[PDB]
Amino acid sequence: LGFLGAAGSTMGAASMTLTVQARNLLSHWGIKQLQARVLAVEHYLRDQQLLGIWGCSGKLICCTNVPWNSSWSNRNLSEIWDNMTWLQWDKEISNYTQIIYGLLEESQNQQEKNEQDLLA
Amino acid sequence: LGFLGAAGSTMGAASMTLTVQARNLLSHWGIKQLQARVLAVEHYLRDQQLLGIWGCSGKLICCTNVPWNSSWSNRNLSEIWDNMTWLQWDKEISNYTQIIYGLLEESQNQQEKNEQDLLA
Amino acid sequence: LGFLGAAGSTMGAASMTLTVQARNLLSHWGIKQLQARVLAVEHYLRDQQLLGIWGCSGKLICCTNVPWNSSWSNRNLSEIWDNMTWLQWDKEISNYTQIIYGLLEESQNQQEKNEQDLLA
Amino acid sequence: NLWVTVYYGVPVWKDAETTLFCASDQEIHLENVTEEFNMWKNNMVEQMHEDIISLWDQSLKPCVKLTPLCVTLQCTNVTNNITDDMRGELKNCSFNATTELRNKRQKVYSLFYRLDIVPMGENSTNYRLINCNTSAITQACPKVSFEPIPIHYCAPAGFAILKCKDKKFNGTGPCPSVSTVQCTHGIKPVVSTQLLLNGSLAEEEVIIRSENITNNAKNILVQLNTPVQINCTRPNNNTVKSIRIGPGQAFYYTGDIIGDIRQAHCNVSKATWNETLGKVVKQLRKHFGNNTIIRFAQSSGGDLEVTTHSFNCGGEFFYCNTSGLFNSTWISNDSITLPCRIKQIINMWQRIGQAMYAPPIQGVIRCVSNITGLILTRDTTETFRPGGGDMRDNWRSELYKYKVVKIEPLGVAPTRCKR
Amino acid sequence: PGQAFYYTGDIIGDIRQAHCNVSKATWNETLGKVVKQLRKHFGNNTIIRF
Amino acid sequence: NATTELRNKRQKVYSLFYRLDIVPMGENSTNYRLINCNTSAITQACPKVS
Ligand SMILES: *[C@@H]1O[C@H](CO)[C@@H](O[C@@H]2O[C@H](CO)[C@@H](O[C@@H]3O[C@H](CO)[C@@H](O)[C@H](O[C@H]4O[C@H](CO)[C@@H](O)[C@H](O)[C@@H]4O)[C@@H]3O)[C@H](O)[C@H]2NC(C)=O)[C@H](O)[C@H]1NC(C)=O
Ligand SMILES: *[C@@H]1O[C@H](CO)[C@@H](O[C@@H]2O[C@H](CO)[C@@H](O)[C@H](O)[C@H]2NC(C)=O)[C@H](O)[C@H]1NC(C)=O
Ligand SMILES: *[C@@H]1O[C@H](CO)[C@@H](O[C@@H]2O[C@H](CO)[C@@H](O)[C@H](O)[C@H]2NC(C)=O)[C@H](O)[C@H]1NC(C)=O
Ligand SMILES: *[C@@H]1O[C@H](CO)[C@@H](O[C@@H]2O[C@H](CO)[C@@H](O)[C@H](O)[C@H]2NC(C)=O)[C@H](O)[C@H]1NC(C)=O
Ligand SMILES: *[C@@H]1O[C@H](CO)[C@@H](O[C@@H]2O[C@H](CO)[C@@H](O)[C@H](O)[C@H]2NC(C)=O)[C@H](O)[C@H]1NC(C)=O
Ligand SMILES: *[C@@H]1O[C@H](CO[C@@H]2O[C@@H](C)[C@@H](O)[C@@H](O)[C@@H]2O)[C@@H](O)[C@H](O)[C@H]1NC(C)=O
Ligand SMILES: *[C@@H]1O[C@H](CO[C@@H]2O[C@@H](C)[C@@H](O)[C@@H](O)[C@@H]2O)[C@@H](O)[C@H](O)[C@H]1NC(C)=O
Ligand SMILES: *[C@@H]1O[C@H](CO[C@@H]2O[C@@H](C)[C@@H](O)[C@@H](O)[C@@H]2O)[C@@H](O)[C@H](O)[C@H]1NC(C)=O
Ligand SMILES: *[C@@H]1O[C@H](CO[C@@H]2O[C@@H](C)[C@@H](O)[C@@H](O)[C@@H]2O)[C@@H](O)[C@H](O)[C@H]1NC(C)=O
Ligand SMILES: *[C@@H]1O[C@H](CO[C@@H]2O[C@@H](C)[C@@H](O)[C@@H](O)[C@@H]2O)[C@@H](O)[C@H](O)[C@H]1NC(C)=O
Ligand SMILES: *[C@@H]1O[C@H](CO[C@@H]2O[C@@H](C)[C@@H](O)[C@@H](O)[C@@H]2O)[C@@H](O)[C@H](O)[C@H]1NC(C)=O
Ligand SMILES: *[C@@H]1O[C@H](CO)[C@@H](O)[C@H](O)[C@H]1NC(C)=O
Ligand SMILES: *[C@@H]1O[C@H](CO)[C@@H](O)[C@H](O)[C@H]1NC(C)=O
Ligand SMILES: *[C@@H]1O[C@H](CO)[C@@H](O)[C@H](O)[C@H]1NC(C)=O
Ligand SMILES: *[C@@H]1O[C@H](CO)[C@@H](O)[C@H](O)[C@H]1NC(C)=O
Ligand SMILES: *[C@@H]1O[C@H](CO)[C@@H](O)[C@H](O)[C@H]1NC(C)=O
Ligand SMILES: *[C@@H]1O[C@H](CO)[C@@H](O)[C@H](O)[C@H]1NC(C)=O
Ligand SMILES: *[C@@H]1O[C@H](CO)[C@@H](O)[C@H](O)[C@H]1NC(C)=O
Ligand SMILES: *[C@@H]1O[C@H](CO)[C@@H](O)[C@H](O)[C@H]1NC(C)=O
Ligand SMILES: *[C@@H]1O[C@H](CO)[C@@H](O)[C@H](O)[C@H]1NC(C)=O
Ligand SMILES: *[C@@H]1O[C@H](CO)[C@@H](O)[C@H](O)[C@H]1NC(C)=O
Ligand SMILES: *[C@@H]1O[C@H](CO)[C@@H](O)[C@H](O)[C@H]1NC(C)=O
Ligand SMILES: *[C@@H]1O[C@H](CO)[C@@H](O)[C@H](O)[C@H]1NC(C)=O
Ligand SMILES: *[C@@H]1O[C@H](CO)[C@@H](O)[C@H](O)[C@H]1NC(C)=O
Ligand SMILES: *[C@@H]1O[C@H](CO)[C@@H](O)[C@H](O)[C@H]1NC(C)=O
Ligand SMILES: *[C@@H]1O[C@H](CO)[C@@H](O)[C@H](O)[C@H]1NC(C)=O
């Protein structure tokens, strides 16, 4: 039930421990320790900025309007959520995360403009 | 009307100055000053992360689905909002804030899963 | 199509590149480099805090309930969005941004209180 | 059909290097995680190496620098009852030292080990200290101990340390039993050469670890599953005297020896040592042939710092001859006494521009320690000899079970949920 | 103690003065160009002396 | 008369200096000091550093 305890569990089980890991992301001699702390903050903020760009700010589970390409993975839901742990899944689609991230950004950019014109 | 000016006022009056305090949370010799600045940022981010975990990201007043236990405090609304300043209130329930924070996290975790299954 | 590429384009064109600039805001000898990094983070967080205070957390385009005073600028939409680049616009209303920011904060403070009383 | 869903707080990580921090004077099992470990490519070792050296150097910054002592010394034989094993080991050296006032000098005599001095012009009365031509010696502060106090290494937020709990793990490859820890166990920075002292023991069997076992250019780290106790002594009663060589600057030296002069030595139980080697041989035969010959031999060459067992015993620096431990051939209440030399001028790390003077310790010295592993090199018939000159191997022996990874909490997967 | 000082012990052969060589023609072309541009800030029917 | 690696020894050294680096003392034509001996300590640049 602690940090990374679910690392060996199935994706559908591990997805219930997202707050366990989220809370462990934040907290001349002594300078390299400041560099490590500053860097940890910068890393954290980049992931948070990215979620904001995709329209997922403030949440751990975020649904989008980006469809899945089976060229990315053609496994079904029982193969992915009831087997392939998150470590296994990450390896399998590592080659596609930049394509997916680009498509999440493009979608949010269309959504924010369509919503401003409906408030007009 | 300045920072902490409302500290001696009633909770229902002090609650109208939340932006006054929120804006004053952010801004070898010289190293201890960097440590103080890095630490101030880390503190800030932990409170913001915690609000996000509870589903209160981006707001100063956030209503939740967590009921009040009168074992925490059995005072009524006139006792709490028209007397007991925030300093007094903080002392009275200090023993219960970890129980309340845990219950806020558990509630948000159920809310995000119930909302993803209704978008399915 | 890169960072600040749209700087010489019209406001209505440049507004479509907001993610290009947003992503370039984050990333004794060596101390002044830590000071620069800590400062960059603090600057970033102040702008993000300010958007949160105004109720614009998590978005690049945010509509508000603050009307425009033509004392601030009496130009029409074709003058502003189909000419005056953002650099030109920023010069023209620089004298009024603190008035506008104050009015955005006041509006959000009324909105959050009206919404808590409708959930009651 | 299926839509991209974004998840944050995902239990995923990637190998990474970072800066670990100290902790000096918690564990999660990860039930179905198999992880790939690789000691020798473990950067925790490189960090520990640099931190130990840096802390060592920092401790000498406020200590007396012995530049007034780079003078000619006039050395004669010590007028005492010196045994055969000690003839030529000590010299009685006279010199003109500075005092707290610039226009005054004092005549001082002291005892030096022969290893710390060198003749000038091949002259038998005039000697200089060993470092006068390469460096300034700094005297270690008498109030600061050399005790190897345990250090724990802790990860920064966003990182984690994984630990391998497999009792038969040899430093590389998959580890089926992995846990996550906040900070490592306390590791004592014991500095020694060919015999590893006061480390961790193997849980079940002697473990032989090598980056490439068939490569004779690599060292073999042998972890024992039982300690071998070794008793070291300097059986001479030293009278320690001091002088002021400057404004509040005191130099410490041995004035004289009370009683007879005898050689320093270490004792290893003969039977325990023979059992230990039999176990090492059985495991070597799993990498080498079974119907083979395993021979142990003494170090082949190099200076005293690498041909002997070097260690700090009660503050003194010993250089013990281990040919009595590694002289046997294995084909298909006695003790072993190991003679030891003592030095006051040492270089610690394999460096040229630094030297330290270890002031002598008053009285008679005895220390007891555990041999918890060996460092061997390899030349039918295979021959193994003691190695261990590079301190990074001492630290690999404790850090081999730990790995540092970076946490990567953001990820995506297909679901039936759409915005 | 490990501190070496370096110095010139001697000179082999004759002792001559160190010097630099600038092409005469290239230098005169260079100044002519500089003068033409100085005359855009100073008068045209002027004298420029180096 | 230069110092040596031992404190109680001296060595006789001769070297060539440029006149710009030395100054006469008391207007004496045999006795000169280095230029900086009255204002600073000279540090020798390391020969291994370009
Ligand atoms: C392997 O581990 C063993 C077990 O820990 C270790 O043996 C210990 O060594 C220390 C240091 O030599 C011993 O501590 C000393 O004991 C004497 C006798 O009572 C004291 O007088 C000493 O105090 C003086 O010196 C100190 C500086 O060292 C001063 O700070 C102090 O004020 C005094 O002037 C000191 O307490 C300890 O007793 C032994 N332990 C046992 C069980 O024998 C061994 O050294 C380790 N081996 C290696 C190579 O690291
Ligand atoms: C190491 O072993 C030797 C024996 O080989 C020990 O020497 C004896 O010490 C006692 C005193 O305790 C004397 O009475 C004996 O006469 C000594 N014997 C010999 C042959 O010299 C020695 O003490 C042991 N070691 C250590 C490290 O203390
Ligand atoms: C080192 O040599 C000195 C002499 O140079 C020894 O000290 C002398 O000892 C005799 C007795 O044998 C005394 O009468 C003298 O007065 C002492 N001289 C001085 C200057 O103290 C000294 O004992 C020798 N050191 C050792 C360890 O044997
Ligand atoms: C440890 O002691 C042994 C003797 O027991 C030394 O070995 C001798 O080394 C010389 C070369 O200097 C050879 O000629 C002899 O044949 C060797 N003797 C034996 C019995 O093999 C060894 O050199 C010593 N080691 C150290 C570091 O002092
Ligand atoms: C600087 O002066 C020294 C003498 O003070 C010159 O060295 C001598 O040269 C003669 C030959 O002309 C030798 O016989 C001497 O033995 C040398 N003396 C020493 C101390 O080496 C030296 O050559 C002069 N330097 C220069 C550059 O001319
Ligand atoms: C799905 O992807 C199809 C093939 O795209 C190519 O292969 C994948 C693995 C990536 O490497 C990508 O960069 C390549 O272009 C497309 O042909 C198909 O149109 C895509 N489906 C969409 C976007 O509707
Ligand atoms: C989900 O998929 C299950 C496994 O399918 C088979 O094995 C995988 C690894 C692929 O090679 C695939 O092409 C094979 O057919 C099926 O047994 C299961 O019925 C599927 N579930 C649904 C609802 O379709
Ligand atoms: C309200 O709390 C009741 C008592 O809970 C106990 O006392 C409080 C003060 C805390 O110390 C808590 O940890 C103790 O368990 C519960 O019996 C009651 O069920 C709670 N009401 C709820 C949760 O419905
Ligand atoms: C709110 O509470 C007022 C005070 O109640 C009394 O004093 C407090 C401190 C407790 O000891 C409580 O048990 C006492 O009864 C009441 O006067 C007031 O009527 C209450 N208001 C409402 C709407 O119920
Ligand atoms: C619009 O502004 C009018 C004039 O306000 C004054 O001039 C502007 C440029 C600022 O300097 C401001 O501080 C001055 O007060 C107001 O008279 C008018 O009421 C404003 N419109 C609103 C707020 O409804
Ligand atoms: C938008 O404005 C255009 C320009 O208006 C004229 O020039 C500006 C700079 C001011 O001085 C203004 O007072 C002048 O009248 C008009 O040509 C255009 O028709 C306007 N568009 C609409 C929809 O009203
Ligand atoms: C590990 O696998 C077993 C099934 O073999 C399962 O019961 C257990 O819950 C899994 N562990 C974790 C952390 O999911
Ligand atoms: C693993 O995948 C299969 C489909 O390939 C599915 O039937 C099963 O539910 C998944 N998990 C288990 C329990 O094996
Ligand atoms: C991913 O990319 C590698 C090349 O970098 C390729 O060999 C592999 O087949 C790709 N497919 C996967 C694992 O999705
Ligand atoms: C302090 O108490 C008085 C009543 O005694 C009240 O009028 C005043 O507003 C209070 N001060 C603050 C800051 O609320
Ligand atoms: C304080 O509490 C009482 C109820 O206990 C309430 O009637 C009153 O409004 C509160 N504030 C004042 C004005 O005293
Ligand atoms: C809070 O806890 C303390 C003990 O830590 C206890 O004495 C006190 O009665 C508790 N009650 C309050 C003030 O809510
Ligand atoms: C610059 O102005 C020209 C019109 O003169 C326009 O076509 C071009 O797109 C503008 N450049 C940018 C970056 O907008
Ligand atoms: C510039 O402003 C005028 C109105 O003043 C408008 O008609 C035109 O669309 C704008 N842009 C262009 C294309 O000149
Ligand atoms: C802005 O303020 C300046 C004085 O600071 C004033 O001269 C100018 O007219 C003002 N108007 C603009 C450019 O909006
Ligand atoms: C001094 O000791 C050496 C042994 O290192 C020996 O060869 C020499 O003869 C001795 N000299 C005297 C005068 O005793
Ligand atoms: C110490 O100084 C005396 C002169 O006072 C000298 O005779 C003696 O040789 C010097 N000692 C050494 C080691 O040089
Ligand atoms: C110092 O002298 C020894 C000989 O006694 C020699 O081996 C060593 O290389 C010399 N050190 C330096 C820096 O020249
Ligand atoms: C260590 O274990 C790995 C994996 O089984 C094996 O390939 C390697 O040869 C072993 N090395 C030694 C020295 O035992
Ligand atoms: C291990 O060493 C042998 C020589 O004994 C060499 O042939 C082999 O390539 C080396 N293997 C690796 C992985 O370096
Ligand atoms: C060593 O000398 C001291 C006097 O300084 C004496 O008290 C002690 O008993 C002696 N120890 C031995 C082993 O001779």
Ligand SMILES: *[C@@H]1O[C@H](CO)[C@@H](O)[C@H](O)[C@H]1NC(C)=O
């Ligand atoms: C080392 O000393 C202990 C007592 O401290 C003794 O029991 C043991 O037998 C000795 N070991 C050897 C090899 O002499």
Ligand SMILES: *[C@@H]1O[C@H](CO)[C@@H](O)[C@H](O)[C@H]1NC(C)=O
């Ligand atoms: C060491 O073990 C070998 C092999 O069993 C045996 O022949 C030899 O006598 C043993 N030596 C000692 C000292 O026990």
Ligand SMILES: *[C@@H]1O[C@H](CO)[C@@H](O)[C@H](O)[C@H]1NC(C)=O
């Ligand atoms: C080597 O000998 C041992 C007995 O000492 C035996 O158990 C093992 O199976 C043998 N290995 C081979 C490859 O013959």
Ligand SMILES: *[C@@H]1O[C@H](CO)[C@@H](O)[C@H](O)[C@H]1NC(C)=O
């Ligand atoms: C090895 O042991 C033999 C006796 O078996 C002995 O003669 C020889 O000198 C020893 N070698 C060393 C280096 O001690």
Ligand SMILES: *[C@@H]1O[C@H](CO)[C@@H](O)[C@H](O)[C@H]1NC(C)=O
């Ligand atoms: C040697 O190991 C034993 C067993 O773990 C331990 O009790 C003893 O203290 C150790 N000896 C030393 C000197 O650390």
Ligand SMILES: *[C@@H]1O[C@H](CO)[C@@H](O)[C@H](O)[C@H]1NC(C)=O
């Ligand atoms: C400088 O040297 C180059 C050859 O390196 C030669 O061609 C050129 O003419 C020389 N310039 C002058 C001014 O002498």
Ligand SMILES: *[C@@H]1O[C@H](CO)[C@@H](O)[C@H](O)[C@H]1NC(C)=O
């Ligand atoms: C200066 O003279 C140049 C010709 O060398 C001519 O082109 C230029 O126009 C003249 N400028 C003025 C101000 O007369």
Ligand SMILES: *[C@@H]1O[C@H](CO)[C@@H](O)[C@H](O)[C@H]1NC(C)=O
């Ligand atoms: C050193 O002496 C020179 C004359 O040779 C003089 O000009 C200079 O000012 C003096 N420097 C100082 C610091 O007095």
